[PDB]
Amino acid sequence: NALKADFESLRDQLQKAATNAKFNGVSLADGSTTKLSFLANEDGSNFTVTAQTL
């Protein structure tokens, strides 16, 4: 029972660490968006990277 309660506790802290991963309102691990397309060139070309949900 103690190991089980510890397992639930670490699962809760893992969920909190996933929720708190964001920089200035955007995140690549929380899963808030499928991708973020960063700028690549002056013509509006985009350097996309798909978000990796955690």
Partner: protein, 54 residues
């Protein structure tokens, strides 16, 4: 009489020089403002900005 009349033609050509000079003096500002507008729209095209910076 023709040689005396030519002075008004010289005056008109010089007035036109001054007019295109003023037009270029404002066109420099227009090109700088267009470059800043392209700067803003280009930075705004990125999807990683939060709603406030956008």
């Amino acid at each position: 009489a023709t040689a005396s009349s030519l002075n008004s033609v010289k005056d008109s050509l010089q007035r036109g020089q001054s007019t295109i000079d003023v037009a270029l003096a404002a066109g420099d500002t227009i090109t700088d403002l267009l470059t800043k507008m392209k700067e803003k729209a280009l930075a705004a095209s990125d999807t990683s900005l939060n709603t406030a910076s956008f």
